[PDB]
Amino acid sequence: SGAIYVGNYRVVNRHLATHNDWANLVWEDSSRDLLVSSTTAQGCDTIARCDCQTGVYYCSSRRKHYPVSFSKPSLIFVEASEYYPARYQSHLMLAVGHSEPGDCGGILRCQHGVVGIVSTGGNGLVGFADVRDLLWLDE
Ligand SMILES: CSc1ccccc1CN1C[C@@H](C(N)=O)CCC1=O
Ligand SMILES: [Zn+2]
């Protein structure tokens, strides 16, 4: 689990969104596995606005942060799960690293801020849903 809190927004994995996230829906994209909902309290996370390909992510299945090299956002084929059938997920970045389903929501960060959140894994790979293109999260 895990969320990004920026301004009056809350960014989560779409498959993990609650009834409250859906009742206060701002934007959602099934092909990206993202959902943004509105919050009353002001969040103070900083979103990165860059093209970095190195950063650090939090892996709850190991209680550790890991430094990783990751690919640029792209259309990557993702095997079926109980939340989605086999499909292409867009704006997805892969790294060599450990990732389990319960790890979804762990933040990936570079020196500029939050890059994205854990969304996929398996075969020794970890996939992050990118958030750097969502410029409206800051306004
Ligand atoms: C070993 S499978 C795995 C591992 C880490 C993280 C996620 C998975 C599989 N997964 C993919 C998500 C997606 N974005 O389509 C939806 C929920 C889910 O459990
Ligand atoms: Zn950066």
UniProtKB/Swiss-Prot annotation:
It catalyses: Selective cleavage of Tyr-|-Gly bond in the picornavirus polyprotein. The active site is at H15 (for protease 2a activity), D33 (for protease 2a activity), C104 (for protease 2a activity). Zn(2+) 1 binds at C50, C52, C110, H112. It comes from the Viruses. Homodimer. Cysteine protease that cleaves viral polyprotein and specific host proteins. It is responsible for the autocatalytic cleavage between the P1 and P2 regions, which is the first cleavage occurring in the polyprotein. Also cleaves the host translation initiation factor EIF4G1, in order to shut down the capped cellular mRNA translation. Inhibits the host nucleus-cytoplasm protein and RNA trafficking by cleaving host members of the nuclear pores. Counteracts stress granule formation probably by antagonizing its assembly or promoting its dissassembly. This is Protease 2A.
